Amino acid sequence: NQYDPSLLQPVPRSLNRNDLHLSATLPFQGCDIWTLYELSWLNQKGLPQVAIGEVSIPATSANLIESKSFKLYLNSYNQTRFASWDEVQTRLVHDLSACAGETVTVNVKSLNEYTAEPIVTMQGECIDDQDIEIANYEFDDALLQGAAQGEEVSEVLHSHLLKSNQPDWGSVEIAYHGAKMNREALLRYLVSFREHNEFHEQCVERIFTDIMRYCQPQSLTVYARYTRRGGLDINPFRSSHQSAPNHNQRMARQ
Amino acid sequence: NQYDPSLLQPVPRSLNRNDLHLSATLPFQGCDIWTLYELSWLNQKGLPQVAIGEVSIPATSANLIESKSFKLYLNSYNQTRFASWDEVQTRLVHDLSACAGETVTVNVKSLNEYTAEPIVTMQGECIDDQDIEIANYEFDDALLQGAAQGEEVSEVLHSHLLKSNALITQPDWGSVEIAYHGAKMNREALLRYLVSFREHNEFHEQCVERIFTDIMRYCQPQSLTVYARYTRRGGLDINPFRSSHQSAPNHNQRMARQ
Ligand SMILES: NCc1c[nH]c2nc(N)[nH]c(=O)c12
Ligand SMILES: NCc1c[nH]c2nc(N)[nH]c(=O)c12
């Protein structure tokens, strides 16, 4: 099967946001950064081309794009001849923007651009090394109740323990300014996502809205980077004060 | 549920090797390097642990391990408490060696070991940049016929254009590095040959062996190494290494698409 933009499946963002009981206007801004590790097509002469794509979808887009459908859409490029790399990037912008409902940004880079590019970790302190027992993996947001009692602080915390539903795996970076967060509670909360079902996008939005309503920080940023499924990974960034992360560099599991 | 070694499914190497007309005594030595990006389990206290696994399976093993079973087997660790990372590494070795049929080597690394680790590309000259037309995608090994007419040389070549499917599937993507000492290979022929794999259905390990045996039969190098690095599926990638003279690749460093 060749190029087929109708393979893309929009999912209205409002659908699962309704269950976060949001306000009229969004409490956050941000974007979903997708890495397309498998991007490949044929040039005009039938010679395969390979590239890595990077896509940025604004969090204000009416829809997100269902990842399997994104994967299938990309696969439809595989056996398709395009006259150039510019054409490929342009069609990607067109189709993805059409689907999302807002202009999407797309970078199509040759593999060579990645040579020597670092695997990175996240900012701040990892909260994952704690001596605690967890017997119960059921999602409990109330785990955050009275979570930030501390001194007013600006800090960045991260965790590699985000898991969801076969399993999805992710790391999450939480930067905030407010009463200092209890690290055990935060860890327990994050771990409680383990058995639970939502899109990565929806999960980041849940974590943001839960932290905001329980811990009431002055400013908050929640940024997760998930390992790829079907050659694509999703990296939702949601912030009270900030538009996007500085770069797309991959983490160890990605 | 809980840790379950029975999920592992071996696939005998003999299947494809018979297909490639090999005897019990192999033209090559080597191993299959797997990277396990998703390895996770619970510590004794129920706190999730995450690691990247690195598994080397000797090419002399009776069996390979079917990737999906391997993934499912690994998932069974997710909700299981293990006493230590040491116990995890031990269980992996024991179970994977039993499935493969020979002692497998396993390294379980913390995520932190990868910080600042650079992405690498393969060695030598990329053959991918050629202005040529591909008329059809059917696998053709005869594309290598008369492919090394050149003066005697030692060189390393690579291509990012390896693609494959399998009956069990969704395309697989890979890069392949070929180092040889022999009559110099025509790069157009080699590139075409590799591209002709696009619609091919076989496992990564089988592909690499096919490429090695094809190059050996058609190009008759004095020594040959074929090393492919494939993108992951289900959290696992396979990097088969096959050489006349060498037992293993120098490292597991990941490539752009991996
Ligand atoms: N992770 C499950 C999943 C399936 N399809 C998806 N599409 C998007 N955009 N995000 C997701 O998290 C998923
Ligand atoms: N990629 C196809 C595939 C499915 N299962 C597999 N198991 C192994 N060992 N190798 C493979 O290439 C595959």
Side-chain angles (χ1 to χ4, degrees):
Chain A
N1 296 348
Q2 289 192 46
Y3 170 77
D4 190 2
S6 76
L7 288 169
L8 289 163
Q9 182 61 68
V11 182
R13 289 193 192 267
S14 57
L15 212 33
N16 305 104
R17 293 187 167 156
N18 197 47
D19 306 291
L20 302 179
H21 310 321
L22 287 177
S23 42
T25 43
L26 299 169
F28 46 69
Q29 45 188 310
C31 55
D32 308 321
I33 306 290
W34 290 67
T35 310
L36 325 184
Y37 289 93
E38 316 198 323
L39 204 58
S40 190
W41 61 98
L42 305 181
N43 71 12
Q44 195 49 248
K45 292 192 174 189
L47 191 72
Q49 304 290 297
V50 294
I52 291 174
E54 289 174 10
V55 173
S56 180
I57 313 189
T60 55
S61 71
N63 311 307
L64 55 74
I65 302 186
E66 193 285 309
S67 64
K68 192 167 67 178
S69 80
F70 204 151
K71 173 182 61 75
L72 292 174
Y73 167 67
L74 294 176
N75 280 326
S76 77
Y77 280 70
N78 293 349
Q79 280 309 104
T80 307
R81 303 186 177 206
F82 298 88
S84 65
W85 280 50
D86 184 89
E87 183 185 343
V88 166
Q89 186 275 355
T90 297
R91 291 203 177 276
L92 286 169
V93 169
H94 181 271
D95 295 340
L96 299 177
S97 300
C99 186
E102 185 173 346
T103 300
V104 164
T105 70
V106 178
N107 297 335
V108 177
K109 311 154 63 166
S110 58
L111 306 195
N112 302 284
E113 294 210 346
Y114 289 81
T115 302
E117 284 303 285
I119 291 160
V120 298
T121 185
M122 277 163 161
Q123 292 180 236
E125 333 194 42
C126 184
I127 69 167
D128 293 344
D129 196 27
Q130 292 188 32
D131 321 281
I132 56 180
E133 209 214 329
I134 304 184
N136 176 21
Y137 304 88
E138 182 179 18
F139 173 84
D140 186 21
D141 51 309
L143 282 169
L144 287 190
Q145 195 111 243
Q149 306 194 349
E151 22 142 359
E152 164 219 11
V153 302
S154 259
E155 75 179 353
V156 183
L157 303 167
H158 67 258
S159 178
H160 302 298
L161 305 192
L162 209 46
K163 172 198 193 265
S164 291
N165 292 262
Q166 244 76 111
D168 294 313
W169 304 98
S171 302
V172 61
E173 179 178 282
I174 295 160
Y176 71 98
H177 172 54
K180 189 184 198 283
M181 304 187 58
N182 182 285
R183 282 172 198 202
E184 172 168 348
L186 183 50
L187 186 54
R188 294 195 181 272
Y189 172 75
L190 290 183
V191 164
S192 75
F193 282 81
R194 198 161 189 82
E195 301 152 5
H196 180 245
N197 300 326
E198 268 192 325
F199 285 14
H200 298 345
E201 298 87 327
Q202 295 153 10
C203 286
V204 172
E205 295 187 1
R206 187 175 293 277
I207 289 168
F208 186 102
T209 60
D210 280 347
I211 285 178
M212 191 64 80
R213 68 187 171 100
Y214 291 104
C215 309
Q216 305 202 296
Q218 250 230 318
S219 58
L220 167 65
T221 293
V222 187
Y223 180 38
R225 288 191 69 80
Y226 287 86
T227 67
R228 67 183 77 173
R229 296 270 80 109
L232 304 176
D233 63 35
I234 309 177
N235 307 280
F237 180 92
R238 298 292 185 279
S239 181
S240 49
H241 306 74
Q242 170 178 352
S243 292
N246 303 327
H247 54 76
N248 193 25
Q249 274 308 324
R250 83 185 74 189
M251 309 190 59
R253 300 180 294 177
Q254 291 181 304
Chain B
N1 317 277
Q2 290 292 288
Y3 155 87
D4 191 4
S6 80
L7 293 171
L8 289 166
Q9 303 302 325
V11 178
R13 298 189 190 270
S14 54
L15 285 171
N16 190 257
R17 287 177 178 176
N18 239 23
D19 294 353
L20 297 177
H21 313 279
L22 303 178
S23 68
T25 70
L26 313 167
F28 49 65
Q29 49 189 302
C31 56
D32 301 322
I33 307 309
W34 295 64
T35 312
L36 289 38
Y37 291 97
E38 289 164 0
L39 186 61
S40 188
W41 62 98
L42 313 173
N43 69 10
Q44 199 53 93
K45 293 180 170 172
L47 182 58
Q49 303 300 284
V50 289
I52 291 175
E54 188 157 333
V55 174
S56 183
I57 307 188
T60 54
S61 76
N63 304 321
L64 55 95
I65 302 176
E66 193 280 314
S67 193
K68 183 172 188 185
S69 70
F70 201 153
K71 180 194 66 188
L72 295 174
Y73 160 75
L74 291 181
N75 290 332
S76 76
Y77 275 72
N78 297 343
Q79 291 313 115
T80 302
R81 292 183 188 201
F82 292 83
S84 69
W85 282 48
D86 296 326
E87 180 182 354
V88 166
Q89 204 243 64
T90 301
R91 296 269 62 74
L92 288 172
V93 170
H94 181 279
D95 300 334
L96 295 179
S97 296
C99 187
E102 190 178 320
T103 300
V104 164
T105 291
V106 177
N107 202 36
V108 182
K109 303 165 69 159
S110 69
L111 302 192
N112 288 326
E113 308 188 39
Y114 297 83
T115 303
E117 178 69 23
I119 290 163
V120 311
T121 188
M122 285 170 154
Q123 291 156 356
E125 299 208 299
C126 185
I127 66 178
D128 289 349
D129 180 45
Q130 290 191 47
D131 191 30
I132 59 166
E133 190 151 25
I134 313 294
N136 71 64
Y137 305 88
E138 61 177 348
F139 175 72
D140 191 8
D141 70 346
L143 285 172
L144 294 172
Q145 172 71 51
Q149 316 261 31
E151 64 280 30
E152 178 185 355
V153 296
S154 308
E155 66 180 353
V156 188
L157 306 170
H158 69 264
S159 175
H160 305 292
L161 300 190
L162 212 36
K163 175 184 185 285
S164 72
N165 319 129
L167 301 183
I168 311 180
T169 64
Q170 185 59 217
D172 297 303
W173 307 96
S175 289
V176 60
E177 188 179 272
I178 296 161
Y180 69 97
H181 167 212
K184 184 185 199 159
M185 290 187 67
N186 182 280
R187 305 187 188 190
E188 172 173 344
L190 180 50
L191 173 61
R192 289 179 177 288
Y193 167 73
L194 289 176
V195 167
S196 78
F197 273 85
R198 251 184 127 64
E199 332 273 62
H200 194 64
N201 296 272
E202 67 188 359
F203 284 0
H204 295 163
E205 302 93 323
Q206 303 163 338
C207 281
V208 171
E209 288 177 10
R210 185 176 292 273
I211 292 176
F212 182 103
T213 53
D214 279 346
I215 292 176
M216 187 66 76
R217 296 183 164 116
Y218 284 104
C219 308
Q220 302 167 69
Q222 304 184 50
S223 79
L224 170 69
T225 304
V226 182
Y227 184 25
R229 297 195 55 87
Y230 289 90
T231 59
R232 69 180 83 169
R233 292 274 160 251
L236 291 172
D237 68 30
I238 315 180
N239 313 271
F241 174 97
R242 300 295 183 279
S243 189
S244 52
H245 56 316
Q246 302 168 343
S247 55
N250 307 126
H251 52 94
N252 197 28
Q253 283 178 285
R254 90 181 68 178
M255 297 183 66
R257 295 178 298 174
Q258 284 183 310

